[PDB]
Design a protein around this ligand. Structure first.
Ligand SMILES: NC(=O)c1ccc[n+]([C@@H]2O[C@H](COP(=O)([O-])OP(=O)(O)OC[C@H]3O[C@@H](n4cnc5c(N)ncnc54)[C@H](OP(=O)(O)O)[C@@H]3O)[C@@H](O)[C@H]2O)c1
Ligand code: SF4
Ligand code: SF4
Ligand code: SF4
Ligand code: SF4
Ligand code: SF4
Ligand code: FES
Ligand SMILES: [Zn+2]
Lengths: 89, 147, 111, 106, 262, 176, 206
């Protein structure tokens, strides 16, 4: 999504009737690719066997402190503090 | 028409060949500036000559930290320089006060004293990264005086 | 007594007088030796406005410290020291400068 | 043979004996009740006995110095200046100066 | 008034004064979790355990009064062995939220681990998690971060009026929630987020906006609602976002108005 | 310990005096000093031309800042202000707002290159390992504005270096 | 303890003998307070006589210090008397480190250490620069670390880190480097101070 000319990335406003933005005219402004967090919802939810499940990115190699997530309510799946990954049952 | 465009590049090639920098020993950056002389990473007679001299030199490297005591001192050096002059702010202190910054004595930005064309971000500015500063300067010289 | 400083009450006033003569003689000398800058007459007017802000005199302890400081910041010219028309310049060149009024300052909106 | 310092290593005995006997008299001019005279005298008398017993031996120089006689002579040379300054400015004999304000803990 | 020496220094105290209340006169703060200012005196943690001069078992500071002239040491050998132990029990079943958690430096439990608890290691394997409790406008409540104490439980019963928070289970499954799905009433219950030591109950309007680190505090009386004075407002560059209740003797009873907190 | 720098009269009589005089009459030791550079000329120089050859490095090296992300999308930075307070230059600024619904990860994220003395402190203080210092040298601008890093974006554009970062961090977990 | 303790106290009682020996002279003119902690000795001195204390330890039969090398000063606004000039002294023959302190507010002049120690005059210039403490009977009191057109004293806790005159433009005037501009970037004031007392025994009763 883009408003007029400049494209919005990670919730950002361009300019109100072109007043603040003037430097980004000759040089092209930066934009993060897929910054709308569409890849967060694109990942499929994993099925759980236990009442509480531990989350990890990829062991001790990837930066993820261990958080236990509770699954009690049927509506709205529980997600960890670091990841957008959801768990059911 | 064709000769006019090609002769301009020949004058620009003269600065692309050799650049004489000022040896300012005003920093820890200056020790890394001495690593440009150190054989492992060299622009020495590739372009750089360590003869320096306040008048004959074309380039001046502002090495690191500048105080309010050196603020009038470095300004008069810039006036002694010839018209084709390029200023490299090698080091984070030279870019805008890497450390200190909010301090009373250290001048922020260097551009408040002397205008900068090429910025080098590194504290201990690695000689590998320092090699870019001279190579970018040579690349930046493209076209001078059309009419 | 405690503490000594340098002079006692009345003697401290005459130390300023000796300091005033030494700085009054240097402002014509710091035009040819240094730079033209502004004016010889305007440089002497800069002296009088400096001493007006310092004019209070309640204790000799405060006065004596001003003499030592006065024999330093005004000494930065006598024994020939590098400044290059940047140091030892007291007057603002790029000052706006702001005024104290409820109509002038409030229109610009400050504090 | 010469010492490493700028002071020349001169072969002189009893030179240490003259200076150490001179300083004892200066201490017994003005201070008498003070502890400064009472404590410094017994160290000097202990050192003078080592000079009288040992004749030009390096072991005598090794006692409380161990940097030859040249370093020990410098200790005696400034001792007369330190004793005269202590006699001129009263500090050891008299104590009557005001106490500091009650604050010390950071 | 009966006098009893605490850490050798003698301090005069009332006949019905608490052990922690007596410690305040000697200028020493014991490790706390259950309040002493306005909330009712209750156990249900055993952190403030102090050892007497001649006693086989340590007594809690909130419950046990001084009464008789008995010596009690704050920096004792038995107390330090106790304080390091209880901290490990509190953190054996703690969800690990510290970087994500709304509090960080403001958290009382965060400081007590640094000051009193064991540093080198903590023996733990497998922590239980609680389901998120229902909350209305103020305070985005997370039951996992809660340590299960009695502070907010008594706050709704005594200070706020309308009771909602209580007990739900028995073991390490008992939640501090309302059990029945119902939103919390306004009145003066907006100050409940400021009461809790852990990062469990924290204001939803100013959640994750600014941490306790790097925020300039200034005290000012609130304009909205009459008889409101002393409220700390964190600047944290340009615009103020968090407003917390400052301690007052007579003007306010250490609780901000629900209209003023949001 | 004592080592002594003074020679204490190398010349004594006849034979020891003449050779000490011969080096001062003509030169000898200058010709011997000439031979030191002579052999130094023949041996191969250790020189690296930058546009073609590259100098030695390490698995852990700090250059230009770039923030990493999870393998299945999602920004790894959690917004703590942890790295903000540790920063000795105060180059890093962070203001956080909730992302749409549920998630709470950043809004303002500027790292000044006018500041920053390069510590790896922000790499160390980070519990989620967001800022990982990649092998970077190439950075040269015309202005301060072009040099100081904006709200993530250019930091997120470190994807071109994140392939090396992922390889370098594999030599970082359980340190060396 | 194996890794928790740095060093066991053994020379502490040996260094405590110095805490008695100088105090055995007992001057109200000199001695006052003697503090000894962590293999180190600290003495504070009455303002009236500082030179007689410095002539002592120099030479002397019992202890030979000679080097009155490093010289510091403390800025603290808690006490009624502000500054605290701290002398760090080292012995070569004796191998020990002793400390000499001053307790006076010293906005009013204090006695110089130039006649006793040669390198002391350079440090005395720094104290007049950063703190603003004048030394009586001093030869050549000149500014070193401060600017030539600098107002006040750069270290004092009464004024900010940025200062009043700090930013130096060039702009409109061809040669004159600017001074009166005062604005700088915002230094974030951290309010990080931990609740609960850090250490016992250090707590003082109100
Ligand atoms: N003291 C006086 O002489 C005096 C007295 C009274 C009034 N004034 C007024 O004050 C002003 C003084 O200005 P100045 O003479 O100092 O300016 P200037 O030195 O001539 O500088 C003007 C610059 O603008 C560029 N430029 C202008 N027109 C251009 C065009 N058509 N195409 C490309 N480049 C162009 C030129 O670049 P290139 O060289 O690269 O083309 C030149 O470097 C005048 O406008 C005049 O009205 C002056
Ligand atoms: S940028 Fe780093 S290396 Fe260069 S002068 Fe500053 S502190 Fe020294
Ligand atoms: S409640 Fe306190 S200790 Fe626990 S995660 Fe939150 S901030 Fe950290
Ligand atoms: S929410 Fe807080 S106050 Fe309430 S029981 Fe849990 S830890 Fe205690
Ligand atoms: S870089 Fe790391 S420490 Fe800094 S805010 Fe992001 S997650 Fe927190
Ligand atoms: S490397 Fe150091 S100075 Fe640079 S952002 Fe990280 S903590 Fe700050
Ligand atoms: S703090 Fe006293 S019982 Fe919990
Ligand atoms: Zn996760």
């Amino acid at each position: 999504x883009x408003x007029x000319x400049x494209x919005x990335x990670x919730x950002x406003x361009x300019x109100x009737x072109x007043x603040x933005x003037x430097x980004x005219x000759x040089x092209x402004x930066x934009x993060x690719x897929x910054x709308x967090x569409x890849x967060x919802x694109x990942x499929x939810x994993x099925x759980x066997x236990x009442x509480x499940x531990x989350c990890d990115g990829g062991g001790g190699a990837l930066g993820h402190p261990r958080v236990y997530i509770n699954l009690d309510k049927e509506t709205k799946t529980g997600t960890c503090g670091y990841c957008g990954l959801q768990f059911r049952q | 028409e064709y000769v006019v465009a090609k002769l301009d590049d020949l004058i620009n090639w003269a600065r692309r060949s050799s650049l004489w920098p000022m040896t300012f020993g005003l920093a820890c950056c200056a020790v890394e500036m001495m690593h440009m002389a150190a054989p492992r990473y060299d622009m020495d007679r590739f372009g750089v000559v360590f003869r320096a001299s306040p008048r004959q030199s074309d380039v001046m490297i502002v090495a690191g930290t500048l105080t309010n005591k050196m603020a009038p001192a470095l300004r008069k050096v810039y006036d002694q320089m010839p018209e084709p002059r390029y200023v490299v702010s090698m080091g984070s202190c030279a870019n805008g006060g890497g450390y200190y910054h909010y301090s009373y004595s250290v001048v922020r930005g260097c551009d408040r004293i002397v205008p900068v064309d090429i910025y080098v971000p590194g504290c201990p500015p690695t000689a590998e990264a320092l090699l870019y500063g001279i190579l970018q300067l040579q690349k930046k010289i493209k076209r001078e005086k059309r009419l | 007594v405690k503490p000594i400083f340098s002079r006692d009450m009345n003697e401290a006033k005459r130390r300023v007088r000796e300091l005033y003569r030494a700085w009054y003689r240097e402002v014509p000398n710091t035009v040819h030796l240094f730079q033209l800058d502004i004016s010889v007459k305007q440089g002497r007017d800069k002296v009088r406005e400096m001493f007006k802000k310092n004019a209070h005199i309640t204790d000799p302890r405060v006065v004596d410290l001003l003499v030592i400081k006065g024999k330093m910041e005004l000494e930065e010219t006598i024994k020939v020291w590098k400044q290059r028309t940047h140091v030892m310049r007291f007057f603002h060149e790029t000052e706006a400068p702001r005024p104290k009024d409820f109509l002038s300052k409030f229109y610009v909106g400050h504090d | 043979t010469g010492l490493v310092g700028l002071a020349v290593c001169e072969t002189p005995h009893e030179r240490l004996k003259i200076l150490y006997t001179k300083i004892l008299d200066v201490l017994g001019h003005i201070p008498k009740n003070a502890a400064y005279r009472k404590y410094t005298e017994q160290i000097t008398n202990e050192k003078l006995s080592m000079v009288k017993a040992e004749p030009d031996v390096k072991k005598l120089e090794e006692r409380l110095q161990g940097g030859q006689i040249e370093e020990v002579i410098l200790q005696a040379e400034n001792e007369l200046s330190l004793a005269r300054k202590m006699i001129q400015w009263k500090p050891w004999e008299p104590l009557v100066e005001e106490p500091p304000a009650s604050q010390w803990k950071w | 008034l009966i006098e009893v020496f605490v850490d050798g220094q003698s301090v005069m105290v009332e006949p019905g004064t608490t052990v922690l209340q007596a410690c305040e006169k000697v200028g020493m703060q014991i490790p706390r979790f259950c309040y002493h200012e306005r909330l009712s005196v209750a156990g249900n943690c055993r952190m403030c355990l102090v050892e007497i001069e001649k006693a086989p078992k340590v007594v809690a500071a909130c419950a046990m009064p001084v009464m008789k002239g008995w010596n009690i040491l704050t920096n004792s050998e038995k107390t330090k062995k106790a304080r390091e132990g209880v901290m490990e029990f509190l953190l054996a079943n703690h969800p690990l939220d510290c970087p994500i958690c709304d509090q960080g430096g403001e958290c009382d439990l965060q400081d007590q681990s640094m000051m009193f608890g064991s540093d080198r290691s903590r023996f733990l394997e497998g922590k239980r998690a609680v389901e998120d409790k229902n909350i209305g406008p103020l305070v985005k409540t997370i039951m996992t971060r809660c340590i299960q104490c009695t502070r907010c439980i008594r706050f709704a019963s005594e200070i706020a009026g309308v009771d909602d928070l209580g007990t739900t289970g028995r073991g390490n499954d008992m939640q501090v929630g309302t059990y029945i799905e119902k939103m919390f009433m306004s009145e003066l219950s907006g100050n409940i987020i400021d009461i809790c030591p852990v990062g469990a109950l924290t204001x939803x309007x100013x959640x994750x906006x600014x941490x306790x680190x790097x925020x300039x505090x200034x005290x000012x009386x609130x304009x909205x609602x009459x008889x409101x004075x002393x409220x700390x407002x964190x600047x944290x560059x340009x615009x103020x976002x968090x407003x917390x209740x400052x301690x007052x003797x007579x003007x306010x009873x250490x609780x901000x108005x629900x209209x003023x907190x949001x | 310990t004592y080592k002594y720098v003074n020679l204490r009269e190398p010349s004594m009589d006849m034979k020891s005096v003449t050779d000490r005089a011969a080096q001062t009459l003509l030169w000898t030791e200058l010709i011997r000093g000439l031979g030191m550079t002579l052999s130094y000329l023949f041996r191969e120089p250790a020189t690296i031309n930058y546009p073609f050859e590259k100098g030695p490095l390490s698995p852990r090296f700090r250059g230009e800042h770039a923030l990493r992300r999870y393998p299945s999308g999602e920004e790894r930075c959690i917004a703590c202000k942890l790295c903000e307070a540790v920063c000795p230059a105060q180059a890093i600024t962070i203001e956080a707002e909730p992302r749409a619904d549920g998630s709470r990860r950043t809004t303002r994220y500027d790292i000044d290159m006018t500041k920053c003395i390069y510590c790896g402190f922000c790499q160390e203080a980070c519990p989620v390992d967001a800022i990982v210092e990649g092998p970077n040298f190439e950075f040269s601008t015309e202005t301060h504005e072009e040099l100081l890093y904006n709200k993530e974006k250019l930091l997120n554009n470190g994807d071109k270096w994140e392939a090396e970062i992922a390889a370098n961090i594999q030599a970082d977990y359980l340190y060396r | 303890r194996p890794t928790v303790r740095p060093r066991n106290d053994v020379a502490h009682k040996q260094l405590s003998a110095f805490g008695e020996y100088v105090a055995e002279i007992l001057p109200k003119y000199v001695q006052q307070v003697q503090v000894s902690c962590f293999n180190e000795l600290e003495i504070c001195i009455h303002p009236d006589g500082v030179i007689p204390v410095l002539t002592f330890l120099r030479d002397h039969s019992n202890a030979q210090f000679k080097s009155l090398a490093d010289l510091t000063a403390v800025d603290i606004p808690t006490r009624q008397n502000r500054f605290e000039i701290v002398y760090n002294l080292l012995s070569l023959r004796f191998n020990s480190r002793i400390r000499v302190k001053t307790y006076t507010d010293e906005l009013t002049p204090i006695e110089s250490s130039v006649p006793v120690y040669k390198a002391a005059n350079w440090y005395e210039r720094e104290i007049w620069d950063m703190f603003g403490v004048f030394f009586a009977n001093h030869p050549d009191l000149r500014r070193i670390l401060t600017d030539y057109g600098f107002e006040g004293h750069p270290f004092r806790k009464d004024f900010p880190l940025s200062g009043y005159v700090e930013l130096r433009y060039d702009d409109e005037v061809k040669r004159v480097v600017a001074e009166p501009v005062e604005l700088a970037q915002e230094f974030r004031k951290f309010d990080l101070n931990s609740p609960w007392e850090a250490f016992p025994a250090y707590r003082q009763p109100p």
